[PDB]
Amino acid sequence: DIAHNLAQVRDKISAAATRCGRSPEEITLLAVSKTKPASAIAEAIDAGQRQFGENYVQEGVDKIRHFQELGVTGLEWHFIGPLQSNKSRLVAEHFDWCHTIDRLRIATRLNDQRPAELPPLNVLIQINISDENSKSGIQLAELDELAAAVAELPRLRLRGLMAIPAPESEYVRQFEVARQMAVAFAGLKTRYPHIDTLSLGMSDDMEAAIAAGSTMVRIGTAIFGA
Numbered sequence: 584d585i586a587h588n589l590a591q592v593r594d595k596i597s598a599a600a601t602r603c604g605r606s607p608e609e610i611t612l613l614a615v616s617k618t619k620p621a622s623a624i625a626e627a628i629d630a631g632q633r634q635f636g637e638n639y640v641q642e643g644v645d646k647i648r649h650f651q652e653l654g655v656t657g658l659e660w661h662f663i664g665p666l667q668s669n670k671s672r673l674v675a676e677h678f679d680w681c682h683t684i685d686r687l688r689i690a691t692r693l694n695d696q697r698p699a700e701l702p703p704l705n706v707l708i709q710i711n712i713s714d715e716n717s718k719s720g721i722q723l724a725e726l727d728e729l730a731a732a733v734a735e736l737p738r739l740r741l742r743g744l745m746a747i748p749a750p751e752s753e754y755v756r757q758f759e760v761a762r763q764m765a766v767a768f769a770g771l772k773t774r775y776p777h778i779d780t781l782s783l784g785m786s787d788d789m790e791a792a793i794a795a796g797s798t799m800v801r802i803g804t805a806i807f808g809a
């Protein structure tokens with residue numbers, strides 16, 4: 584039951600924030616609806632969920648168009664999958680956020696294809712903080728340079744960072760890795776304007792990510808099942 588699952592996830596988030604001395608309002612729940620049908624999303628919407636993450640362009644755009652045509656206003660759609668050049672126009676025209684900026688050319692493409700009447704596309708730069716096997720994300724040493732270039736793009740808005748850490752079961756390593764992201768995030772925040780989003784944490788490392796300084800967790804299975 585999606586409505587019950589949303590309540591359960593929101594409870595765990597709230598507890599984790601409170602335990603480490605943070606206001607639960609600091610933590611945004613991104614409901615990851617990848618591979619789930621639009622009816623499942625509609626249940627979540629009926630239960631008050633407004634922010635949804637999708638990983639595949641056509642699937643996500645089809646959902647966006649569905650809920651726009653039902654005249655459901657007030658939603659926020661985040662693209663959190665890897666972005667290919669030949670599918671960036673659909674992201675630029677329909678999504679509100681994109682978490683996976685890891686090369687300048689894809690951000691310039693998104694900026695160029697974003698209609699001017701839309702709000703700027705909110706973007707995070709994705710860090711590969713700890714995953715040997717992944718080809719997504721930049722190294723931290725590239726961040727200052729990429730952030731400067733992306734920051735000039737007028738149809739985008741740089742809001743912070745995202746990372747998918749390598750899968751990790753030891754709480755200690757979950758926290759230490761998430762802290763590396765939080766340190767980078769804080770350093771970015773002191774020099775850049777409107778840095779407010781650290782997209783970090785899924786169901787299995789939610790507590791360490793929140794304790795370390797995440798502002799946004801990405802939950803799929805624990806909301807929608809599998």
Ligand SMILES: Cc1ncc(COP(=O)(O)O)c(C=O)c1O
Nearest residue numbers: 638639640641642643664667670
């Ligand atoms: C269900 C579904 N919809 C849409 C797409 C669109 O693909 P892409 O993520 O490359 O944009 C994919 C395939 O990757 C998909 O699996």
Ligand SMILES: *Cc1c(COP(=O)(O)O)cnc(C)c1O
Nearest residue numbers: 615663785786801802803804805
């Ligand atoms: C799919 C995915 C999630 C959610 O995964 P679950 O294990 O089902 O909770 C979160 N973030 C990203 C980037 C994902 O691709």
